[PDB]
Each structure stands twice: as structure tokens, then as C-alpha cells.
Amino acid sequence: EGKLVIWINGDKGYNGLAEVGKKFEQDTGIKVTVEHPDKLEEKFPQVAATGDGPDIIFWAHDRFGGYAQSGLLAEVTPDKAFQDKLYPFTWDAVRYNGKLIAYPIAVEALSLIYNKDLVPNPPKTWEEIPALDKELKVKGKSAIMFNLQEPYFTWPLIAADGGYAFKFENGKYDVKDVGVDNAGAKAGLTFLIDMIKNKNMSADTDYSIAEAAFNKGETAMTINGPWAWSNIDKSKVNYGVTLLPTFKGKPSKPFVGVLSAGINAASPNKELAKEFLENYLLTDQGLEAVNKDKPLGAVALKSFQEQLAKDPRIAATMDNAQKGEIMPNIPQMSAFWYAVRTAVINAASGRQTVDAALKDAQSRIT
Amino acid sequence: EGKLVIWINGDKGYNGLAEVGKKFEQDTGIKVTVEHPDKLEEKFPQVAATGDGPDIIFWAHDRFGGYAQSGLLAEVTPDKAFQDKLYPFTWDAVRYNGKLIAYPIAVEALSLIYNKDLVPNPPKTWEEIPALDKELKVKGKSAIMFNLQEPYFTWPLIAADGGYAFKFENGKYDVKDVGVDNAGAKAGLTFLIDMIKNKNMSADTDYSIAEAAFNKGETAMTINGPWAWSNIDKSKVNYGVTLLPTFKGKPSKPFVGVLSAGINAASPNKELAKEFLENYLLTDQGLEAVNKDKPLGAVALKSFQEQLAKDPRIAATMDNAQKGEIMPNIPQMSAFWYAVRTAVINAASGRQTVDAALKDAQSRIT
Ligand SMILES: OC[C@H]1O[C@H](O[C@H]2[C@H](O)[C@@H](O)[C@@H](O[C@H]3[C@H](O)[C@@H](O)[C@@H](O[C@H]4[C@H](O)[C@@H](O)[C@@H](O[C@H]5[C@H](O)[C@@H](O)[C@@H](O)O[C@@H]5CO)O[C@@H]4CO)O[C@@H]3CO)O[C@@H]2CO)[C@H](O)[C@@H](O)[C@@H]1O
Ligand SMILES: OC[C@H]1O[C@H](O[C@H]2[C@H](O)[C@@H](O)[C@@H](O[C@H]3[C@H](O)[C@@H](O)[C@@H](O[C@H]4[C@H](O)[C@@H](O)[C@@H](O[C@H]5[C@H](O)[C@@H](O)[C@@H](O)O[C@@H]5CO)O[C@@H]4CO)O[C@@H]3CO)O[C@@H]2CO)[C@H](O)[C@@H](O)[C@@H]1O
């Protein structure tokens, strides 16, 4: 304790790393010792399992999932401001079981390195290298030499025509796994129906009726999104924006929508549309103009969002958003919405029980 | 042609959008017309299918996958500099079948909106709202009113206790789908073995032998990563770094490694380790010190990577990286490497045929 021991491979810049450690000690008094043991990536699980080893281990990320599965790595805790400083795909490489288990440093790939004076135009194909070697051999030279003891160096050739390690299956929505008629869905809709039966709400309330009632001070609360705030600003009501109420102790989970602008495939103006959206709308000034009319909520444009993030209404918007879920964009989403609309309206009006309404919606969607 | 027609929903800031369109026309002469038809999200697939409709359509992203499946949307083409200006998860929301099919604008979620003067401390639970309503009703008021005709507004309550739309299955490596002994793997290893048989290479060449031969000008080419460049700089050789050769017309596919720093779970210095890695190593000055010793390649730190990106050696590194694949971090990766090492060494030395070596590796991994 009171020290840092670092392990890094002997082909990396460990002397330069030790100079970073010297600056660390000069500022903090904490000694940093950089070592480069052989087989460090095999020794680490052996010594960390006994509670020994280095404080920090450097390796390519392919070793780290095995370490994390064995409980040998601490979860790292960079805040969002620090995570923003590194490329997102590098954080992905060090994420295991949903947790960040290392700090990414550098991105490595093999390349062809060539002597400009022996091969001014290096070969573009592997197949032409034997002919080049024959000409170099009469000069006492060879075309190419690389490490054949480590599979890292031969893998690019093995993969070229179709070799691979493990196949990756992309994330996907299971369009047959729908949760509209499970017990939790029924419990929430039953509560809504119970409020209607108890005359706390009326089944015929729509957007206009609820907005007028809230903005005239006739009801204490409403549920709406950022576009509604402008009309409340103009009203007499002093309003706050906060977390949706919990149900059975669990957060309400609103669907998160990304307002998006698509370009019609039939448009003869695709270049103009790109210019307008990229260079006029998606600017601080462009979004401010729309936002001043009806608030957008949080915006996708980082520079303008940092100016909105302070507003408690935006903070509440993002707190509810985090408790909820981003909507799928799959084609089946419209079928989902049409079916759920019918279920809620039928249950709220008494044309169906909650169970029969949601069962029918589930059948329609799947 | 020569116009922009925009469709946006009637609850959004369409007058503010039209002012952005006015500025567009003032600068370009191109008229922008903003309309807010009812049912625009249903009308669009009907009119875009006939080659009509608006140039740009605004909606939440949940509608857009259906449009893109129907071929109604143009692929949008923002460059990397523009994509960097928006939050990554917003681009994810508008990606369909691997392609970006809209521009994200805003991030929306419902919140509880409350009258500060009627309910200074708004309810944290749904279950307490009936009691609040009874007290407000004696004052001629009600606790809460919101739109019950659109399922968007009731969904947060339905999802709270377990309702969901479509279940998402996270991306994953299939540890039983291994490509070490397929036809492409065998073809590439066979070519390596054929070069060895033809005496273009020697099976016993290792890292040291290849590095010495290249850096003394005895071989025209080598295959190595960025850490090797420092020793070539000091040598007499004038070297370039370029794309790996193709095989059977296809790019060589090197495995991409992210050099990573993990913190030992047994370390009593986890706070010091975080301080060192975040505030000393992962700085421009910290990475420069390591990089000056042995080059890191591309770095994860955006600010320093932008200073390296100009170097043709780094450009070539990233070109090869893009043709290749990020390594998995799964625990099975070490088994993969050990098995492939044995296969390559055995095939190159003649202790096994290419087919028998790679079949054995495949069996060992699975
Ligand atoms: O005693 C018997 C045997 O020992 C010797 O070989 C062994 C090695 O000493 C030992 O390190 C071990 O090597 C394994 C390694 O543990 C395993 O992780 C995997 O290595 C991968 C890396 O994980 C991967 O990142 C990548 O490594 C790159 C690295 O990213 C890059 O930054 C730079 O450092 O180059 C590295 C490549 O050299 O690829 C490697 C795979 O090539 O697989 C390794 C095995 O190949 O186990 C070795 C075998 O026991 C002696 O060399 C051997 O002669 C003896 O027979
Ligand atoms: O004529 C019969 C019937 O017509 C009327 O209802 C129909 C609507 O006019 C019509 O627009 C259509 O509504 C569908 C919609 O097409 C479908 O996409 C889906 O809507 C989702 C959104 O996709 C989703 O983004 C979200 O919308 C939010 C939005 O994100 C937010 O920014 C803001 O605008 O609030 C929106 C919510 O209002 O959620 C909605 C779902 O609530 O589902 C819609 C159906 O609910 O089809 C309607 C039914 O035919 C009349 O209203 C009706 O009385 C008539 O019986």
C-alpha cells in the first residue's frame, strides 16, 4: 500500500511509461515501479488469485475477459466527462458483462513494413511475393521475413479468405417475444382502470382536455413531454417537471423517442436536404429557433445540449428517459402501437376486461 | 426540384422550423415550406410509394424502420466529423440494417408535470394519487389528467411492473461457431506453408530474427506493429508502412488489439491507480512520453490521436485495422490463441498437414 507496481510487456514503451511514473511521484510522492516480466499475461492470474501481483496490468484487451470472469479485475469508474475523452469503440473493447474492466490506451494492428530502397512499389498481393523473392535472392536478400512463432502475425493471412475466431451475432429484437399481456403489463393497466372506476380519471380525456385542465389550474398534475412546456409557460400556472410516479415500488418506464428527420428516397433535392439538416437545423442557432417555439427536450447536438442540461425540466426529462427504454425502430413497432392503443381504449371504456384486451393485443402483435 | 417541403407533427415547433427555413432561403434562394398534416406518419408511406410526398419527414425514430424496410428513405451520408457532433446513441436510434436512415434531432421522454402551488411536494407513487384526488375534489379540482387516447402516455405505467414491447437480445459471440478449420483458413495457412516449402521463408523465424533482418536491410519487407517502428527509425533503413498484401483478391484481416490497463482486484491502491491512469497516463503529455519510447499506434485519447492521425504510418495502421476485426475479449480467446499457435507451428514445421493441424485446433477450441 502507498505504491504502484505496473506490469507491461517488454515490446512496449516501458521506459517512457516509467517517466510518466516519475512525474506521478514528483507531484504526489507515490513511487511507481514499472516491470516487464516474461509471460506476464500468464503469471497475472496466478499471482492475482493469491492476492498478490501488480496494481496495474497492461495487455491487449483479448486477455481481460478471462481475468474479469475470474474476478481478478476491479471495475473501473470513469465519469461521463472522462469517458467522452476516449473513442467509444475502445470502451467497448474493455466492457465485460456490462462493466468496464480496464482503461483503453492504444489501438494496434499489423501492417506491411517495407524498405523503400529495396521495393519502391511494395507488392499489393501475397501471390506475387515468391517472384519478388527470387529476384532478391540473386542479390543475397529475401522478400519478406516476419515472426512465425506467434499466431498473431500469421492470422491476417489465415483470415483473409474466410478464417475467423468466434462468430459474432449482432444484437436484435426478438419479434416473437412480446410483453404486452404478462402479469406486469396487466397490473399497470388494471391500476389505470381502477383509477377510472374510482372516478379519479375519465376514459374520454384526450390531449386537448388534459392540457386545458392543467394549464387553467383545474388539475394538479399532468403527464406530457417537452413540446407541451411552451403553452404552460404562457399560462398562469407555476409548474415543475419531475420523475413519473413509481408503481409497486418500481419506476415508471416511458418510451424514449428520438425526433428524427428522414430524407424521402423519391426526393430530387437530397443534396439540398443534407445541406439544410446538417448546416442549418443541426446548429446551435437552428435548434434554438425550433426550441424557442416548442421545446425539443434534450437535443442530439452535443454543443446545444450542454446549454440545456442545466434546466431542471431537461434534467427531469433525462432522468425519466434513463428509467425508461429507447423505442425500437423495427417495422413491427407500428403494429405494436396500434394493438396497444386498442387494448387501452377498450379496457378504459369497459368494452373489454384488462386481461382480454391485452391478450388480444398480444395475439395481434405476434 | 429546387424546393424543400418538410413534414413535421403539429405538436412540434413548426413555426420555429419555418424560421430556420427562412434563413436557408435568405442564404441560398431555396424556398422551404413547412407543413404539419394530420396523420403525416401514415400518409407518408402512401405518398412516398407513388414518388410524391415531402423532401424531409420528421417523426420519432420508431416509425422509420418500417419506412426504410419499404425503401422510402434515402441513406443519409454525414461524414465522421459531423457524426461526432451528435450523441452516439442517437445515431443508433436511426440505424436500420446497418445504414443511417435519418438525422437525429431531439431526445424525448414523458415526465410528471405538476402545479407547484397545488402540490408543492408532488407524489412519488401512483398508489397515493387517489387519496390526493379526494382532497383536491373537495376544492373543485382533480389530482391528475393526461391523454388516455394515445398509448404513448399510458405505456410508462404499463411497463413499470414488467410490461415490455419487444425483448432485445444483446450481441454476443457464439463460442461454438469457430472458423479455424474452414476452407478459407486452410487456404491461407496452405499458402504460408507453400512459401516455406519454396524456401521463401523459414519455419524457425521468430520476432528477433525477422526484426534484425529487416533493420539491417537483409529482407525487403516485414510484418509488425507500431511498437517496432522505433528500432527501425534508429536503423539505416528507410521504411514505409502500408496495407498488408491481399490473398485471393481479399484484404488480409489482422486482429485489432486495444492495449488496455486493468486494475488488480487485490490492489490496495485502486484510488491511486485511477488517478495515475486518468490524470497522468491518459493525457497528451503522458501518451507522448510512452509513444516517444515505442510508438503506441493509434491512441484511444481523442485529443492526442488527432495529432497522430496525419502520420502515414498511423494512417496505414488504421487502414489495416478497418480491414481486420477487433479481437473478442471473451475468456475463450486464450484457448483460441493456444490452439492456433500449435496448429501454425505444427503445419509450418511439417509435424502435421495443414488440414490435420487446423482440424485439431478447431476441436480443441470447441
Ligand atoms: O514453454 C512452452 C512455450 O512457451 C513460450 O511460448 C508461450 C509464451 O511465452 C506465453 O506468453 C503464451 O503466449 C500466449 C498468450 O498467453 C496468449 O494470451 C496469446 O497471446 C496473444 C495475445 O493475447 C494477443 O494480444 C496478441 O499479442 C500481440 C500483442 O497484441 C501485441 O501488442 C504485441 O505484443 O504482439 C503480440 C503477439 O506476439 O497475439 C498473441 C498470440 O500470438 O497466445 C500466446 C500463444 O501464442 O504461451 C506461449 C506458448 O506456451 C515459447 O515461445 C514456446 O517456444 C514454448 O514452447
Ligand atoms: O380513424 C380511426 C382513428 O383515427 C385517429 O387515430 C389514429 C391517428 O390519427 C393516427 O395518427 C395513428 O396513430 C398511430 C401512429 O400512426 C403510430 O405511429 C403510433 O404512434 C406512436 C408514435 O409512433 C410514437 O412516436 C409516439 O408518438 C408520440 C411522439 O413520440 C411524441 O413526440 C408526441 O408527438 O406524442 C406522440 C403520442 O401522441 O407514440 C405513438 C402512440 O401513442 O400509434 C398511433 C396509434 O396510437 O392511428 C390512430 C388510430 O387509428 C383517432 O384518434 C381515432 O379516434 C380514430 O378511431
DSSP letters, B202-245, are -TT--HHHHHHHHHTTSEEEEEE-GGGHHHHHHSS--EEEEPPP
Q: Which residues of A touch B210 (CB under 8 A)?
A: 145-147
Query: Which secondary structure element, helix H or strand E, spans residue A76, and what is its range?
Result: none
In sequence order, the 6+-apart residues with CB closer than 8 A to the CB of B151 are A337, A340, A341, A343, A344
B326 CA distance to ligand 1 centroid (A)?
18
The residue of chain A nearest to residue B106, with distances taken between CA atoms, is: A299
Beta-carbon count within 10 A of A27 CB: 11
Q: How far apart, in whole angstroms, are the C-alpha atoms of residue A128 and residue B181? A: 25
Distances (CA, A) of A211 to A116, A193, B46: 74, 21, 31
Residue B147: phi, psi to the nearest 5? -65, 115
Q: Is the dihedral of CA A276, A281, A283, A288 positive or negative?
A: positive
In the block, residue with C-alpha cell 399481456? A181
Per the CB < 8 A criterion, the answer to whether A244 and B122 are in contact is no
Question: Hey, what's the cell of B165?
Answer: 414491447
**Which three-class secondary structure state does DSSP give residue A251?**
coil
Q: Is the dihedral of CA B297, B301, B305, B307 positive or negative?
A: negative
C-alpha gyration radius of chain A: 30
Interface A-B: count of C-beta contacts within 8 A:
994
For residue A247, the 8-state DSSP code is B
To 5 degrees, how large is the angle CA B137–CA B143–CA B144?
135
Q: How far apart, in whole angstroms, are the C-alpha atoms of residue A325 and residue B110? A: 12
Candidates B320, B340, B341; CA nearest to B224 is: B320
In the block, residue with C-alpha cell 432485445? B168
Q: How far apart, in whole angstroms, are the C-alpha atoms of residue A325 and residue A257? A: 9
Candidates B166, B32, B281, B300; CA nearest to A24 is: B281
Q: How far apart are the first and last CA of chain B?
A: 59
Per the CB < 8 A criterion, the answer to whether B139 and A255 are in contact is no
DSSP string, B108-133: E--EEEEETTT-SS--SBSTTHHHHH
For residue A227, the 8-state DSSP code is G
* Paired residues of B259 in beta bridges: A60, A106
DSSP string, B34-85: EE--TTHHHHHHHHHHTT-S-SEEEEEGGGHHHHHHTT-BPPP---HHHHTT
Q: How many helices (H) and strands (E) does chain A have?
A: 16, 15
DSSP string, B250-307: B---PEEEEEEEEEBTT-TTHHHHHHHIIIIITSHHHHHHHHHHS---EESBHHHHHH
DSSP string, A164-214: EEEEEEPPEEEEEEEESSSHHHHHHHHHHHHHHHTTSS-TT--HHHHHHHH
Q: How far apart, in whole angstroms, are the C-alpha atoms of residue A93 and residue B255? A: 13
Is A114 in Cβ contact with B155 (below 8 Å)?
A: no
Per the CB < 8 A criterion, the answer to whether B116 and A239 are in contact is yes
In the block, residue with C-alpha cell 513494413? A113
Question: Hey, what's the cell of B277?
Answer: 491512469
Q: Which residues of A touch B230 (CB under 8 A)?
A: 13
B35 CA distance to ligand 2 centroid (A)?
18
Task: Give the closest of A168, A244, A296 to B106, CB-based.
Answer: A296
Q: Which amino acid is at B102?
A: A
Going along chain A from its start, the domains and CATH numbers come out as 3-100 (3.40.190.10), 114-168 (no CATH), 183-260+298-365 (3.40.190.10)
Please report the residues numbered 139 through 178 in chain B whose beta carbons come closer than 8 angstroms to any beta carbon of chain A.
Answer: 140-175, 177-178
Per the CB < 8 A criterion, the answer to whether A342 and A358 are in contact is no
Question: Hey, what's the cell of A249?
Answer: 415500488
Please report the residues numbered 328 through 357 in chain A whose beta carbons come closer than 8 angstroms to any beta carbon of chain B.
Answer: 328-334, 336-337, 340-341, 343-345, 348
Q: How far apart, in whole angstroms, are the C-alpha atoms of residue B352 and residue B358? A: 9
For residue A84, the 8-state DSSP code is T
Among the atoms of ligand 1, which is closest to the Cα of residue A59? Answer: 25
Per the CB < 8 A criterion, the answer to whether A184 and B205 are in contact is no
Is B253 in Cβ contact with A115 (below 8 Å)?
A: no
Per the CB < 8 A criterion, the answer to whether A175 and A330 are in contact is yes
For residue A112, the 8-state DSSP code is E
Q: Is the dihedral of CA B281, B286, B288, B291 positive or negative?
A: negative
Resolution (A): 1.6
Task: Give the closest of A123, A184, A295 to B245, CB-based.
Answer: A123
Q: Which amino acid is at B311?
A: D
- Determine whether the shortest distance from the Cβ of B148 to ligand 2 is under 6 A: no
Q: Which residues of A touch B32 (CB under 8 A)?
A: 276
Q: How far apart, in whole angstroms, are the C-alpha atoms of residue A275 and residue A349? A: 48
- Determine whether the shortest distance from the Cβ of B41 to ligand 2 is under 6 A: yes
Residue A40: phi, psi to the nearest 5? -60, -30
In the block, residue with C-alpha cell 394538479? A220
Q: How far apart, in whole angstroms, are the C-alpha atoms of residue B249 and residue B245? A: 9
In sequence order, the 6+-apart residues with CB closer than 8 A to the CB of B237 are A115, A117, B214, B215, B216, B217
Distances (CA, A) of A63 to A201, B318, B334: 58, 22, 7
Distances (CA, A) of A346 to A306, A354, B212: 43, 8, 80
Is A155 in Cβ contact with B254 (below 8 Å)?
A: yes
**Which three-class secondary structure state does DSSP give residue B96?**
strand
To 5 degrees, how large is the angle CA A203–CA A208–CA A209?
50
Is B336 in Cβ contact with A165 (below 8 Å)?
A: yes
Q: How was this structure determined?
A: X-ray
For residue A238, the 8-state DSSP code is -
Q: How far apart, in whole angstroms, are the C-alpha atoms of residue B23 and residue A280? A: 8
Distance in Å, alpha carbon of A314 to nearest chain B alpha carbon = 10
Q: Which residues line ligand 1 (CB under 6 A)?
A: A 9, 11, 39, 41-42, 60, 62-63, 108, 149-152; B 225, 257, 334, 337-338, 341
Q: Does B309 touch chain A (CB under 8 A)?
A: no
Task: Give the closest of B21, B145, B290 to A210, CB-based.
Answer: B145
For residue A1, the 8-state DSSP code is -
A12 CA distance to ligand 1 centroid (A)?
15
Question: Hey, what's the cell of A239?
Answer: 409548474
Q: How many helices (H) and strands (E) does chain B have?
A: 16, 15
> Is B56 exposed, middle or buried, given 0-12, 13-18 or 19+ CB atoms closer than 10 A?
buried
Q: How far apart, in whole angstroms, are the C-alpha atoms of residue B122 and residue B132? A: 10
Is B294 in Cβ contact with A13 (below 8 Å)?
A: yes
Per the CB < 8 A criterion, the answer to whether B158 and A216 are in contact is no
